[PDB]
Design a protein around this motif. Structure first.
Motif, mmCIF file in Angstrom:
data_model
loop_
_atom_site.group_PDB
_atom_site.id
_atom_site.type_symbol
_atom_site.label_atom_id
_atom_site.label_comp_id
_atom_site.label_asym_id
_atom_site.label_seq_id
_atom_site.Cartn_x
_atom_site.Cartn_y
_atom_site.Cartn_z
ATOM 1 N N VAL A 158 -2.429 6.117 12.183
ATOM 2 C CA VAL A 158 -1.049 5.815 11.818
ATOM 3 C C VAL A 158 -0.707 4.374 12.168
ATOM 4 N N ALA A 159 -1.192 3.891 13.310
ATOM 5 C CA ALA A 159 -0.874 2.523 13.716
ATOM 6 C C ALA A 159 -1.500 1.503 12.765
ATOM 7 N N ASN A 185 0.708 1.442 9.648
ATOM 8 C CA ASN A 185 2.044 0.896 9.834
ATOM 9 C C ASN A 185 2.051 -0.523 10.363
ATOM 10 N N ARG A 186 0.954 -0.981 10.979
ATOM 11 C CA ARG A 186 0.962 -2.263 11.664
ATOM 12 C C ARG A 186 -0.174 -3.192 11.286
HETATM 13 CL CL LIG Z 1 2.997 3.293 14.062
#
Ligand SMILES: [Cl-]
Ligand SMILES: [Cl-]
Ligand code: NA
Length: 129
Positions: A109-110, A113-114
Motif C-alpha cells: 500500500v505504501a 500511495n507514496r
Molecule cells: Cl500509505
C-alpha cells in the motif's frame, strides 16, 4: 538491523531485485523506506488480526506463518520471524513471489500511495551499485 539507503540498495541488487518483473531498484528501496523505515525488525498488527513483518512488511494472512493468524496461508513457506533477520534473503525471496502474483507492487500500500508515479530513481541516487 536498520539499513542505510545505499546499503539496502546494494543488498537488494545483489539479491536480484533490480528490474525484477520490470521494477527498477528505486521502487524497492522506496517501498522499504515507507513500509518499515529500513528496519528489518518492524512489525505492525492489522485490523483483521494478521501482522506485517520485516523490511517489506510481508503479511501473515497470506505469506508467512506466525502461529496466530487463523485460517491464513503460508505461501512463502517460512516462519514470519525469518522475515525479521538482518539477512534480507528471506524477505527478498518472498517479495519476488508476491510481486509475481499478478498485482505487481500494488500489493504494498505504501508503494502505491507514496512511490508509484514518483521519481523513484532518486532513492538510489549517489549509491555505488
Ligand atoms: Cl500509505
Ligand atoms: Cl530506479
Ligand atoms: Na542481507
Amino acid at each position: 538491523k536498520v539499513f542505510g539507503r545505499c546499503e539496502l540498495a546494494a543488498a537488494m541488487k545483489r539479491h536480484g531485485l533490480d528490474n525484477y518483473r520490470g521494477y527498477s531498484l528505486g521502487n524497492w528501496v522506496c517501498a522499504a523506506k515507507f513500509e518499515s523505515n529500513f528496519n528489518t525488525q518492524a512489525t505492525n498488527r492489522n485490523t483483521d488480526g494478521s501482522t506485517d513483518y520485516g523490511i517489506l512488511q510481508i503479511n501473515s494472512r497470506w505469506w508467512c506463518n506466525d502461529g496466530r493468524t487463523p485460517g491464513s496461508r503460508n505461501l512463502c513457506n517460512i516462519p514470519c520471524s525469518a522475515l525479521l533477520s538482518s539477512d534480507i534473503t528471506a524477505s527478498v525471496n518472498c517479495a519476488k513471489k508476491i510481486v509475481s502474483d499478478g498485482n505487481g507492487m500494488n500489493a504494498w500500500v505504501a508503494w502505491r500511495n507514496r512511490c508509484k508515479g514518483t521519481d523513484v530513481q532518486a532513492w538510489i541516487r549517489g549509491c555505488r551499485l
